[PDB]
Scaffold this active site. Structure first.
Site, PDB file in Angstrom:
ATOM      1  N   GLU A  30       8.383  27.339  -0.772  1.00  0.00           N
ATOM      2  CA  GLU A  30       9.711  27.737  -0.310  1.00  0.00           C
ATOM      3  C   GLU A  30      10.578  26.530   0.029  1.00  0.00           C
ATOM      4  O   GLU A  30      11.806  26.593  -0.120  1.00  0.00           O
ATOM      5  CB  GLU A  30       9.604  28.669   0.898  1.00  0.00           C
ATOM      6  CG  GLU A  30      10.814  29.590   1.031  1.00  0.00           C
ATOM      7  CD  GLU A  30      10.857  30.348   2.349  1.00  0.00           C
ATOM      8  OE1 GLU A  30      11.972  30.490   2.914  1.00  0.00           O
ATOM      9  OE2 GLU A  30       9.782  30.790   2.818  1.00  0.00           O
TER      10      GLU A  30
ATOM     11  N   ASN B 175       8.655   5.636  15.864  1.00  0.00           N
ATOM     12  CA  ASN B 175       7.715   6.640  15.383  1.00  0.00           C
ATOM     13  C   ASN B 175       7.720   7.894  16.249  1.00  0.00           C
ATOM     14  O   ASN B 175       7.518   8.999  15.732  1.00  0.00           O
ATOM     15  CB  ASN B 175       6.312   6.041  15.299  1.00  0.00           C
ATOM     16  CG  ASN B 175       6.204   4.973  14.224  1.00  0.00           C
ATOM     17  OD1 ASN B 175       7.094   4.838  13.383  1.00  0.00           O
ATOM     18  ND2 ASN B 175       5.117   4.208  14.246  1.00  0.00           N
TER      19      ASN B 175
ATOM     20  N   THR C  51       0.830  -1.199   0.000  1.00  0.00           N
ATOM     21  CA  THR C  51       0.000   0.000   0.000  1.00  0.00           C
ATOM     22  C   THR C  51       0.867   1.254   0.000  1.00  0.00           C
ATOM     23  O   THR C  51       0.703   2.130  -0.854  1.00  0.00           O
ATOM     24  CB  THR C  51      -0.946  -0.027   1.204  1.00  0.00           C
ATOM     25  OG1 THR C  51      -1.784  -1.194   1.133  1.00  0.00           O
ATOM     26  CG2 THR C  51      -1.828   1.214   1.234  1.00  0.00           C
TER      27      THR C  51
HETATM   28  N1  GTP Z   1       9.132   3.621  11.034  1.00  0.00           N
HETATM   29  C1  GTP Z   1       8.105   2.795  10.861  1.00  0.00           C
HETATM   30  N2  GTP Z   1       8.152   1.849   9.856  1.00  0.00           N
HETATM   31  C2  GTP Z   1       7.104   1.009   9.669  1.00  0.00           C
HETATM   32  C3  GTP Z   1       5.983   1.073  10.494  1.00  0.00           C
HETATM   33  N3  GTP Z   1       5.118   0.114  10.087  1.00  0.00           N
HETATM   34  C4  GTP Z   1       5.664  -0.543   9.030  1.00  0.00           C
HETATM   35  N4  GTP Z   1       6.906  -0.005   8.775  1.00  0.00           N
HETATM   36  C5  GTP Z   1       7.859  -0.357   7.704  1.00  0.00           C
HETATM   37  O1  GTP Z   1       7.161  -0.297   6.473  1.00  0.00           O
HETATM   38  C6  GTP Z   1       7.523  -1.381   5.642  1.00  0.00           C
HETATM   39  C7  GTP Z   1       6.295  -2.271   5.477  1.00  0.00           C
HETATM   40  O2  GTP Z   1       5.268  -1.494   4.911  1.00  0.00           O
HETATM   41  P1  GTP Z   1       3.861  -1.199   5.635  1.00  0.00           P
HETATM   42  O3  GTP Z   1       3.632   0.282   5.725  1.00  0.00           O
HETATM   43  O4  GTP Z   1       3.750  -1.884   6.980  1.00  0.00           O
HETATM   44  O5  GTP Z   1       2.842  -1.910   4.604  1.00  0.00           O
HETATM   45  P2  GTP Z   1       1.542  -1.226   3.958  1.00  0.00           P
HETATM   46  O6  GTP Z   1       1.817   0.182   3.481  1.00  0.00           O
HETATM   47  O7  GTP Z   1       0.386  -1.260   4.921  1.00  0.00           O
HETATM   48  O8  GTP Z   1       1.281  -2.129   2.653  1.00  0.00           O
HETATM   49  P3  GTP Z   1       0.644  -3.617   2.736  1.00  0.00           P
HETATM   50  O9  GTP Z   1       0.480  -4.026   4.181  1.00  0.00           O
HETATM   51  O10 GTP Z   1       1.551  -4.592   2.033  1.00  0.00           O
HETATM   52  O11 GTP Z   1      -0.689  -3.565   2.052  1.00  0.00           O
HETATM   53  C8  GTP Z   1       8.651  -2.098   6.341  1.00  0.00           C
HETATM   54  O12 GTP Z   1       9.845  -1.483   5.915  1.00  0.00           O
HETATM   55  C9  GTP Z   1       8.414  -1.770   7.797  1.00  0.00           C
HETATM   56  O13 GTP Z   1       9.616  -1.807   8.522  1.00  0.00           O
HETATM   57  C10 GTP Z   1       5.941   2.022  11.516  1.00  0.00           C
HETATM   58  O14 GTP Z   1       4.964   2.110  12.265  1.00  0.00           O
HETATM   59  N5  GTP Z   1       7.004   2.884  11.687  1.00  0.00           N
HETATM   60 MG    MG Z   2      -0.564  -2.955   5.579  1.00  0.00          MG
END
Ligand code: GTP
Ligand code: MG
Ligand code: GTP
Ligand code: A1L8X
Ligand code: MG
Lengths: 429, 155, 431
Positions: free
Chosen positions: A247, A221, A138
């Protein structure tokens, strides 16, 4: 002049949670939207109802409901427009193609119509801040679809990204290098400025500055939102630097394709050290040139600077900033390209930084976020591109994308764009 | 033609039908189109009583079909232990080689008929006999990771 | 991506299926009547993945029970949890298939497949967001193998964007000395290579070997074997049944474990290996759990991983233990064994941790490998198939069911192509 923040996928949503929580504290807004303090530049990020409720100009989107359901039932269950918390039922399964084509297509029109509702409430909409991971299906695929549609529907508006760059320590999918390259290729032309957040850099900082042995997303986070806040403060407060989205581009982006500034933040001090000696302007400014404090792992000494903005918060006297800068341009081998002013832009917000209860950071009297455009950030692209190349040479996992509405030539097209981007940096460097 | 009917009765296990046909001159050593004899078919399909009766009345214990298969090959492949024993007692060639280079030992090893492997070894099966790819029964047990078989073959 | 529809076909399929439901019912605090008597809310968060919620806080397995042989009906019902299954989800024929794949795939089995598809459709239509199907079956018989693969292909037609996952029990002369089983398994593998997204290879050869040589059980029974199977099935579904930072579902498992569509046959493994009713002061350390999980002796397929290379690996730790210690041990195994993991799939070993251990253990680990060494299992079956097919023994049982002799040659060729493909990526370098 309003700004709308859009949070896509789990990483984007959870980081958005932390940001808006911090924003409310910084502006004196309670979790139900009420603000006694006054009733201003925070209106760029918060609308105001007839009942004196201040509502984030924010949309949260995910293809499954798990994470956004937490927002709907948590502390801030009453802060956001409920119709701006949007969920499907089936996520992108870590697959860019499913987020951009097969699953994301089912919800993109609803998302655009709900964004239109927010835009219609603006009298001078500046543009969008878009939060998302590189690695998720996503975060990668739906974001690029959304950015494509926003460019068509809001041609004159600026679009800024905060992008979570993958790290193996906390990654979730083996295909995150593919998703990272695919979304970068298709979003490059639709984004004006993108602040990458290297999960490994944030992970390292949590381990060594905050003494957290195994950082969670919650640890990551809270630190990220502190840094995002220092980046967006100029949009929400009075100030003379980076006062609107345009800017940001003027100051940080000399050419449209190399629009990835490096953020460095100091000081990061464990909340257990509540009586730490306060660090001077010179000390926190010098820390901005230590690679260990950067939001993306790379070495600016191996690159050249094209821009450099210093955003101070707190008890910071301008003459002390100037003296600290003067020292830097001497003792330090900090090389600017020959076509850029070798000057540092300076903003000072005199309110001390806020820290969230529950956070891991000590309160400090003064802090700084340096935003620089350095060719050294191409090292982050090279690390990704190499991981892409290892798998793609064997066509490993590619069948999952071809089966989900994507053509195999899009892989090579995306990778050639990345090669051109790496060359863009070499030619400037 | 009582040969084709004897071949069918042997395969089907029709003991009385086998007795009758032999009493009326049926060719105990009739072959079908691939060279299988009544003894081959009774050995393949596990009809021990028909095996013994055929061997009592002039069956060639070592007849080969067009692929070089003997009755002992087929009994060892399918796993009929009692039939293996009877065939050997009546002179079956324990080291007969078919067109693929296989011996009865090869076939019992491949199919995991460990009791039959032991009987064949006790009757002088050749542990150095190679199939057309150079494999002995021991090679098959090693390549296969069949530790029970390999132990048996090292005796 | 919530609900899974589970199907069990044939004797083996229904026997290991029943054990699965006994084991995870106990993990989720569900009793044989469908009532929840657990004392942790983690047990209920994802109960809907495998159970429907019916009247009065009672939970019913989303499970369809199939067999051409009617006596399997009774065996399941007489089991502890036999009365929990929905009576209308029992779909059974008049006569078994007699270890005849052709009967299961083409004649008796094809006469009953539509009645199964009706119950599947009913379970599928009531799902909020169906993620896919899991099937338990053996490949050595006639029903689970022949009718099982027909079912899979038909479900594939109706539900093309749903994942198909199988627990496929591979035959061994050590457990059933019935010589047509290589025929049935090879015909089945032909089907599975084309029609399933992910297959757990449960090898009766390995199960017997573990019981006989490691657990010192002189005469292993199906219950001895299935004790290992249910531990494995519980371990590999743990991330689907309890909330996890890994967002686990059947499609993400496929995306991260399957780099090439045909190479979707997993080598499962489990630690500690135990015999039932045989508790021991286990308390395995994290270093012991990690070493055993990668030990050939702990694999549920009779292949030596040291003979191939891991394309992808998932390792699921269960119990209360130091995350940091797991991270360090997992990095150790990859650094020491570096040469056993392909270098062209970066970060190809994933670790998950579930707080909740399985019944009777404080510490546990489950291994899911996509290893090129699995070719040893297919080569074993192929050699037995070829030994039989070259003498054409019992072929008439199959062609007499309208089946053609070219399907045998095609299946054997496809399975040998599969072996060549594993060898290809085993020898590939990142250069
Ligand atoms: N810093 C941070 N990274 C995150 C977090 N949640 C997931 N990630 C990172 O994001 C990546 C995984 O993507 P997600 O955002 O969890 O997945 P999504 O966008 O929901 O997409 P799908 O679940 O595949 O549909 C990995 O690199 C994780 O380490 C978060 O809360 N904080
Ligand atoms: Mg997801
Ligand atoms: N591990 C394990 N294997 C089993 C079990 N039951 C049968 N098998 C194996 O399954 C294969 C035979 O398949 P079955 O399931 O019994 O046959 P079927 O699917 O009912 O089909 P039919 O031929 O019509 O009986 C042989 O390899 C057996 O060793 C079991 O409970 N556990
Ligand atoms: C190469 O690295 C990786 C390896 C495996 C996985 C993964 O494993 C599982 C194990 C299970 O037992 C059940 C599952 O549902 C999953 C799963 O869904 C899944 O992907 C989301 C992810 C990876 O990034
Ligand atoms: Mg049966």
């Amino acid at each position: 002049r309003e700004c709308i923040s859009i949070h896509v996928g789990q990483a984007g949503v959870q980081i958005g949670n932390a940001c808006w929580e911090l924003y409310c504290l910084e502006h004196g807004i309670q979790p139900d939207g009420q603000m006694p303090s006054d009733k201003d530049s925070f209106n760029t990020f918060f609308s105001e109802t007839g009942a004196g409720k201040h509502v984030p100009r924010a949309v949260f989107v995910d293809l499954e409901p798990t994470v956004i359901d937490e927002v709907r039932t948590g502390t801030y269950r009453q802060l956001f427009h409920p119709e701006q918390l949007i969920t499907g039922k089936e996520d992108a399964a870590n697959n860019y193609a499913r987020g951009h084509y097969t699953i994301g297509k089912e919800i993109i029109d609803l998302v655009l119509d709900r964004i239109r509702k927010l835009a219609d409430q603006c009298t001078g909409l500046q543009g969008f801040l878009v939060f998302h991971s590189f690695g998720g299906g996503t975060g990668s695929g739906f974001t690029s679809l959304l950015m494509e549609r926003l460019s068509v529907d809001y041609g004159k508006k600026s679009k800024l990204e905060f992008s979570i760059y993958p790290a193996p320590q906390v990654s979730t999918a083996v295909v995150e290098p593919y998703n990272s390259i695919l979304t970068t290729h298709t979003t490059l032309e639709h984004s004006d400025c993108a602040f990458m957040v290297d999960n490994e850099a944030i992970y390292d900082i949590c381990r060594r500055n905050l003494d957290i042995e195994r950082p969670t997303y919650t640890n990551l986070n809270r630190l990220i939102s502190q840094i995002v806040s220092s980046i967006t403060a100029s949009l929400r407060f009075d100030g003379a630097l980076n006062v609107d989205l345009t800017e940001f581009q003027t100051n940080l982006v000399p050419y449209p394709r190399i629009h990835f500034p490096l953020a460095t933040y100091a000081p990061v001090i464990s909340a257990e050290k509540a009586y730490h000696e306060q660090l001077s302007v010179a000390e926190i400014t010098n820390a901005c040139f230590e690679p260990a404090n950067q939001m993306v792992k790379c070495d600016p000494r191996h690159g050249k600077y094209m821009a450099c903005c210093l955003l101070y918060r707190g008890d910071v006297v301008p003459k002390d900033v100037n003296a600290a800068i003067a020292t830097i341009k001497t003792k330090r081998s900090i090389q600017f390209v020959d076509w850029c002013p070798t000057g540092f832009k300076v903003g000072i917000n005199y309110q001390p930084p806020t820290v969230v209860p529950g956070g891991d950071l000590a309160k400090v009297q003064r802090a700084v976020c340096m935003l620089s455009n350095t060719t050294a950030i191409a090292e982050a692209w090279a690390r990704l591109d190499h991981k892409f190349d290892l798998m793609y040479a064997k066509r490993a996992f590619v069948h999952w994308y071809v089966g989900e509405g994507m053509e195999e030539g899009e892989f090579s097209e995306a990778r050639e764009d990345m090669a051109a981007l790496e060359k863009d940096y070499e030619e400037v460097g | 033609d009582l040969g084709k009917k004897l071949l069918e009765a042997a395969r089907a296990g029709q003991d009385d039908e086998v007795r009758i046909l032999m009493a009326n001159g049926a060719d105990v050593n009739a072959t079908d189109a691939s060279g299988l004899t009544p003894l081959h078919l009774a050995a393949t399909y596990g009809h021990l009583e028909i095996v013994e009766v055929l061997l009592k009345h002039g069956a060639d214990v070592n007849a080969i079909d067009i692929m070089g298969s003997t009755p002992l090959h087929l009994a060892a492949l399918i796993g009929h232990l009692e039939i293996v024993e009877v065939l050997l007692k009546h002179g079956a060639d324990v080291n007969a080689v078919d067109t693929w280079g296989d011996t009865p030992l090869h076939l019992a090893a491949i199919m995991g008929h460990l009791e039959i492997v032991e009987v064949l070894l006790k009757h002088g099966a050749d542990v150095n006999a190679q199939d057309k790819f150079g494999k002995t029964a021991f090679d098959i047990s090693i390549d296969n990771g069949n530790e029970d078989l390999a132990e048996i073959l090292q005796k | 991506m919530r609900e899974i529809v589970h199907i069990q076909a044939g004797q083996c399929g229904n026997q290991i299926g029943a054990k699965f439901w006994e084991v995870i019912s106990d993990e989720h605090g569900i009793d044989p009547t469908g009532s929840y008597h657990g004392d942790s809310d983690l047990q209920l968060e994802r109960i809907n993945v495998y159970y429907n919620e019916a009247a009065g806080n009672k939970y019913v397995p989303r499970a369809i029970l199939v067999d051409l042989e009617p006596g399997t009906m009774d065996s399941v019902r007489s089991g502890p949890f036999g009365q929990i299954f929905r009576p209308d989800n029992f779909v059974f024929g008049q006569s078994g298939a007699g270890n005849n794949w052709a009967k299961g795939h083409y004649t008796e089995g094809a006469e009953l497949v539509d009645s199964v598809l009706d119950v599947v459709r009913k379970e599928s239509e009531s799902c909020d967001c169906l993620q896919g199907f899991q099937l338990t079956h053996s490949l050595g018989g006639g029903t689970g193998s022949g009718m099982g693969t027909l079912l899979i292909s038909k479900i594939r037609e109706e539900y093309p964007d749903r994942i198909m996952n199988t627990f496929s029990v591979v035959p061994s002369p050590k457990v059933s000395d019935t010589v047509v089983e290589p025929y049935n398994a090879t015909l089945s593998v032909h089907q599975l290579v084309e029609n399933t997204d992910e297959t757990y290879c449960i090898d009766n050869e390995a199960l017997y070997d573990i019981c006989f040589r490691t657990l010192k059980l002189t005469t292993p029974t199906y219950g001895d074997l299935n004790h290992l199977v249910s531990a494995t099935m519980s371990g590999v579904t743990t991330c689907l049944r309890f909330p996890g930072q890994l967002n686990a579902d059947l499609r993400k498992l496929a995306v991260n474990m399957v780099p090439f569509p045909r190479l979707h046959f997993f080598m499962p493994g489990f630690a500690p290996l135990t015999s039932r009713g045989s508790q021991q002061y286990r308390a395995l350390t994290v270093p012991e759990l990690t070493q055993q999980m990668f030990d050939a002796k702990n694999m549920m397929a009779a292949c030596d991983p040291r003979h191939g290379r891991y394309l992808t690996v998932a390792a699921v730790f269960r119990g209360r233990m130091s995350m940091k210690e797991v991270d360090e041990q997992m990095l150790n195994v990859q650094n020491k064994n570096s040469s056993y993991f392909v270098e062209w799939i970066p970060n190809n070993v994933k670790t998950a941790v579930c707080d909740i251990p399985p019944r009777g253990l404080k510490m546990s680990a489950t291994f899911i490998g996509n290893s090129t060494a699995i070719q040893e299992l297919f080569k074993r079956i192929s050699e037995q198939f070829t030994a039989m097919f070259r003498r054409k023994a019992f072929l008439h049982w199959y062609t007499g069911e309208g089946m053609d002799e070219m399907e045998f040659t095609e299946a054997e060729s496809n399975m040998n192509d599969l072996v060549s493909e594993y060898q290809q990526y085993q020898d590939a370098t990142a250069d």
